[PDB]
Amino acid sequence: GSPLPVLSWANREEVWKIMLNKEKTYLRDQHFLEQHPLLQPKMRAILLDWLMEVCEVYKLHRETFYLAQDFFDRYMATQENVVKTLLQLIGISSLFIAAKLEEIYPPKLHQFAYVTDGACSGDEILTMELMIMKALKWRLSPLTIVSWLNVYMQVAYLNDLHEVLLPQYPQQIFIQIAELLDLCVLDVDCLEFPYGILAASALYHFSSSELMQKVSGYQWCDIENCVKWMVPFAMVIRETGSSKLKHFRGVADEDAHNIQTHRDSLDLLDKARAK
Amino acid sequence: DMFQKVEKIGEGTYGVVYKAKNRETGQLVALKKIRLDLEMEGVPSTAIREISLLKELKHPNIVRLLDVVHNERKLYLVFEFLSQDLKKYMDSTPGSELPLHLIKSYLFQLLQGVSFCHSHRVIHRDLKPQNLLINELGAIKLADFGLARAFGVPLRTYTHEVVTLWYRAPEILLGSKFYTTAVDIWSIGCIFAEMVTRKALFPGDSEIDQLFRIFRMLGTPSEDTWPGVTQLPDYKGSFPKWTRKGLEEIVPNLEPEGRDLLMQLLQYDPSQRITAKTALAHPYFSS
Numbered sequence: 278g279s280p281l282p283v284l285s286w287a288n289r290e291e292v293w294k295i296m297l298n299k300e301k302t303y304l305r306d307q308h309f310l311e312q313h314p315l316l317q318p319k320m321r322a323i324l325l326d327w328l329m330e331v332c333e334v335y336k337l338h339r340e341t342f343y344l345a346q347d348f349f350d351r352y353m354a355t356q357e358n359v360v361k362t363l364l365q366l367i368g369i370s371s372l373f374i375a376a377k378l379e380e381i382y383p384p385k386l387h388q389f390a391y392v393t394d395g396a397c398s399g400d401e402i403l404t405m406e407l408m409i410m411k412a413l414k415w416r417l418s419p420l421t422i423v424s425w426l427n428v429y430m431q432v433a434y435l436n437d438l439h440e441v442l443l444p445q446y447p448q449q450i451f452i453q454i455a456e457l458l459d460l461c462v463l464d465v466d467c468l469e470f471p472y473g474i475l476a477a478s479a480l481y482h483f484s485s486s487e488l489m490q491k492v493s494g495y496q497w498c499d500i501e502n503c504v505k506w507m508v509p510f511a512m513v514i515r516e517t518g519s520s521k522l523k524h525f526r527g528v529a530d531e532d533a534h535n536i537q538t539h540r541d542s543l544d545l546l547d548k549a550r551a552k
Numbered sequence: 553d554m555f556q557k558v559e560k561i562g563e564g565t566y567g568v569v570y571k572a573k574n575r576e577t578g579q580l581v582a583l584k585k586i587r588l589d590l591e592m593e594g595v596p597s598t599a600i601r602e603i604s605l606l607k608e609l610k611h612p613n614i615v616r617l618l619d620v621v622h623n624e625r626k627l628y629l630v631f632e633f634l635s636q637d638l639k640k641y642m643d644s645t646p647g648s649e650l651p652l653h654l655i656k657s658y659l660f661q662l663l664q665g666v667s668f669c670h671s672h673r674v675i676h677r678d679l680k681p682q683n684l685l686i687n688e689l690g691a692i693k694l695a696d697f698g699l700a701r702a703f704g705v706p707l708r709t710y711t712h713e714v715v716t717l718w719y720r721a722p723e724i725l726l727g728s729k730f731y732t733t734a735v736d737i738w739s740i741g742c743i744f745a746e747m748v749t750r751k752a753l754f755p756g757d758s759e760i761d762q763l764f765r766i767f768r769m770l771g772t773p774s775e776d777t778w779p780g781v782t783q784l785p786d787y788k789g790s791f792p793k794w795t796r797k798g799l800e801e802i803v804p805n806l807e808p809e810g811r812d813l814l815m816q817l818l819q820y821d822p823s824q825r826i827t828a829k830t831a832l833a834h835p836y837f838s839s
């Protein structure tokens with residue numbers, strides 16, 4: 278099962294089992310917007326796209342963004358009949374929690390309020406964050422989509438079997454795949470696929486089935502439906518061209534691949550879902 | 553609320569810990585209280601981390617979170633109660649109350665707890681005797697996960713100058729960009745020695761005093777003992793060049809195989825440092 282090498286600090290198979298059980302304990306519903314019957318999937322795509330932009334401005338990690346997306350989608354699936362006017366508050370509160378979890382120096386509440394441009398106050402965000410955390414039962418430690426890409430890349434590029442914890446993958450392959458994942462995640466249909474299979478499918482579209490299998494342990498039967506779902510998204514990414522690694526002020530250049538970026542993806546999402 | 557707040561045990565990494573009792577059950581609990589009215593940024597990062605970790609981290613040698621209660625501008629973490637912590641036990645007792653067999657069973661349990669954490673991709677980053685809770689049956693549990701972090705594989709750069717100074721690993725003192733689960737193993741070696749000697753192994757006053765106490769006993773590290781050590785942010789050629797003191801003289805009452813374990817726990821080079829899993833297979837624990 279384990280694509281991982283032998284580990285000194287743990288059993289490889291056990292570490293990999295623990296990770297797969299997590300995926301099953303954290304449950305996602307591609308149909309959760311049927312509980313909010315007057316909301317459209319485009320509303321979620323705009324909200325998440327907006328959160329990526331906030332992330333890029335505050336040099337937040339991709340991990341912080343994907344944590345917020347998971348909290349958003351799992352919180353909404355616990356609730357019913359949420360009015361479209363509260364999505365910004367739920368989104369920004371999700372990101373507030375995600376930032377306090379993942380960031381060393383997270384932005385202050387005043388900045389999360391500032392980006393909402395009047396709509397959401399600090400008090401509204403403090404109220405909402407508690408509402409979210411109690412609804413989720415404080416289950417705030419998922420393996421995100423991007424956490425799976427981090428580990429697949431490490432396995433692909435592993436040189437030192439004594440340094441499996443020290444990252445040793447190239448930066449441009451990582452951000453190219455993350456760009457495809459950032460596009461897919463704007464479509465709520467993505468939630469039908471486990472987050473490890475989404476990571477694996479986006480890697481396969483930039484790779485081979487030889488590599489996908491090597492880094493992930495999945496077989497073709499496992500990712501087939503996801504891979505096929507993901508094709509219009511891959512195609513659109515290929516035709517628009519991939520983005521170059523950015524430098525971020527105050528971010529080490531060997532750490533810059535971990536910073537969430539943002540392009541005009543709602544145009545790509547239209548193009549993609551056309552097909 | 554539904555608790556007779558017997559008393560205040562003390563203060564954690566965050567909040568205040570109280571001993572209390574349930575009225576309905578009569579059961580003894582610990583209460584870590586947060587004042588949400590005094591928190592400009594809402595629930596503290598440390599609290600969100602501890603709650604989220606301990607919801608999914610369950611093991612005989614890890615303290616149990618029983619409930620999280622939100623009543624007013626107050627948030628209460630309800631924990632199983634334990635009667636002693638290792639710091640207060642060691643400050644209240646003779647050496648005879650910490651025999652060689654109880655040190656062995658305490659250390660074994662600590663490694664099982666830490667090993668479970670590392671396999672669940674968690675680093676405590678604050679292992680010290682005050683955070684080690686002991687019951688009357690002979691169990692020891694890790695507590696206070698407010699300074700802990702779930703790590704990724706592979707891991708990124710995280711907060712620096714973590715871990716209480718006395719139990720802090722030298723790769724953190726030399727300002728290394730990446731630290732791993734090995735920092736938790738340094739602390740354990742420091743606690744192991746402290747249990748046998750009844751006093752702290754490295755009682756430093758500063759980061760540089762801390763680093764000199766370590767060098768005095770283990771020797772000043774070189775590219776030969778610790779490859780890359782010279783390329784570390786806070787390394788200086790200006791450092792004195794002490795040499796290894798014999799461990800037989802620090803911990804004479806400790807058996808041969810146990811002095812081998814302590815030497816392996818307290819390796820300078822975090823890459824050459826034993827893991828919790830390997831440590832549990834050590835001959836020390838097979839008589």
Ligand SMILES: CCc1cnn2c(NCc3ccc[n+](O)c3)cc(N3CCCC[C@H]3CCO)nc12
Binds near residue numbers: 615
């Ligand atoms: C997790 C909550 C908990 C449950 N029991 N317990 C104990 N029990 C032992 C003990 C010690 C001294 C007096 N009394 O009455 C009992 C201590 C303790 N702590 C140690 C001191 C600073 C706070 C806190 C740090 C580590 O959680 N926290 C807890």
